Amino acid sequence: VDEYMKEAVDHYAGQLMSLDINTEGNLYAAFHKNPGVITGSAVGCDPDLFWSKIPVLMEEKLFAFDYTGYDASLSPAWFEALKMVLEKTSIFNSMINNLIIRTLLLKTYKGIDLDHLKMIAYGDDVIASYPHEVDASLLAQSGKDYGLTMTPADKSATFETVTWENVTFLKRFFRADEKYPFLIHPVMPMKEIHESIRWTKDPRNTQDHVRSLCLLAWHNGEEEYNKFLAKIRSVPIGRALALPEYSTLYDRWLDSF
């Protein structure tokens, strides 16, 4: 645990401090109740609503990257660090990520003020920002000194600038609604959804499983959604399900804000 990790610890800790958490488990409830740039976690968030808030919590320049074997590569130094924070699973990997980003930032650039780092992590996945454009390609270099193997965001061939158009968090894109632009749709690619379809070893789970897939799919738009429902209804097992009409999912969503 070097000097950089120490400042990461002090800074991250001091932050979680403002939350005034109960020292008597209760850490999990604090995080679940406060998904954002203070916990620096999204664990327990609700995409359908949280997506409209994220753009406001972020600084101007986004930056993200992929981890290769995030858990396996986690050296003991980090846990030691995590302990120091606590002294001062998803919720923990998220806390570790918060330590990594800070550490690598302090090690890759001079003049970094962590109070201006706005990031939200969910395990190894993270959406980050800073007032100035930061290079994940340079952060990746510093990562080697810690056994971390960082690569472009979303299995990208090269390291390119992260924008609100190409950025993804929890595998979802950010797309403003066409009718009300300030309501941000969490958009999971249809491909990812199709590859999630399962005929449960217990047929009874099928309905609720597909329901949860529909709650993700309709965010790709009425045409894609109905195309999706048509596929499911092309065979008997899919025709036996009760699938939400696009119209109602969208309307309920608008009324939920």
Side-chain angles (χ1 to χ4, degrees):
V1 175
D2 58 16
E3 298 292 310
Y4 300 116
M5 296 171 98
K6 285 183 179 177
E7 199 184 318
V9 171
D10 286 318
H11 180 270
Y12 185 43
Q15 209 178 82
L16 299 181
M17 212 61 100
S18 67
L19 288 174
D20 301 306
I21 314 180
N22 176 51
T23 53
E24 308 174 303
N26 283 296
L27 177 68
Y28 298 42
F31 269 52
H32 278 62
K33 301 181 181 183
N34 299 298
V37 298
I38 301 301
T39 51
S41 162
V43 187
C45 82
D46 169 17
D48 277 356
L49 291 174
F50 197 46
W51 250 234
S52 284
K53 193 184 190 186
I54 293 184
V56 161
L57 304 176
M58 299 301 264
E59 283 299 331
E60 191 190 326
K61 300 300 184 194
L62 302 183
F63 76 87
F65 54 87
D66 285 3
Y67 280 105
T68 286
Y70 182 69
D71 303 77
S73 54
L74 297 181
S75 93
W78 298 108
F79 296 88
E80 186 57 48
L82 176 53
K83 294 179 179 181
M84 296 183 256
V85 185
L86 289 170
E87 179 182 306
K88 287 169 165 284
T89 295
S90 281
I91 296 184
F92 287 112
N93 280 331
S94 288
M95 293 186 74
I96 289 175
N97 221 331
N98 269 270
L99 285 174
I100 295 169
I101 302 294
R102 293 181 168 62
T103 290
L104 306 192
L105 259 187
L106 292 171
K107 197 163 190 170
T108 306
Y109 296 80
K110 299 202 166 177
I112 290 291
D113 167 16
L114 295 189
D115 290 349
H116 291 312
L117 158 69
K118 304 304 178 185
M119 63 166 278
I120 306 181
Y122 192 126
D124 72 317
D125 193 349
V126 61
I127 183 167
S129 64
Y130 191 70
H132 303 312
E133 201 183 329
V134 157
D135 277 5
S137 67
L138 286 179
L139 291 176
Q141 285 304 325
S142 285
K144 294 174 177 183
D145 312 325
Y146 299 97
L148 301 178
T149 284
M150 298 146 61
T151 55
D154 309 329
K155 305 177 182 181
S156 178
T158 66
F159 281 111
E160 298 306 318
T161 294
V162 179
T163 67
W164 279 111
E165 179 179 0
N166 66 11
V167 79
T168 67
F169 188 44
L170 311 187
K171 303 185 181 188
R172 307 162 161 82
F173 286 92
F174 296 67
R175 292 289 175 276
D177 181 76
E178 302 85 2
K179 185 73 176 187
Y180 313 81
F182 293 176
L183 305 188
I184 307 295
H185 289 270
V187 185
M188 189 176 272
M190 282 308 309
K191 181 183 179 181
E192 167 74 59
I193 292 174
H194 275 301
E195 318 192 319
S196 294
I197 306 186
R198 252 58 167 173
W199 184 48
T200 320
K201 181 177 177 180
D202 181 335
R204 299 202 14 112
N205 294 303
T206 299
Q207 162 72 20
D208 287 359
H209 174 60
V210 178
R211 173 184 59 181
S212 73
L213 293 194
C214 289
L215 301 198
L216 298 182
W218 79 270
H219 279 296
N220 280 287
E222 171 163 34
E223 197 185 76
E224 274 297 298
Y225 185 69
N226 290 318
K227 208 174 178 178
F228 173 68
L229 292 194
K231 161 186 173 177
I232 288 165
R233 310 201 77 245
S234 60
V235 304
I237 287 167
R239 276 195 293 275
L241 311 178
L243 305 167
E245 276 295 337
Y246 178 81
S247 165
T248 66
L249 295 165
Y250 186 31
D251 285 334
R252 171 176 64 180
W253 184 66
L254 295 176
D255 288 351
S256 71
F257 284 97

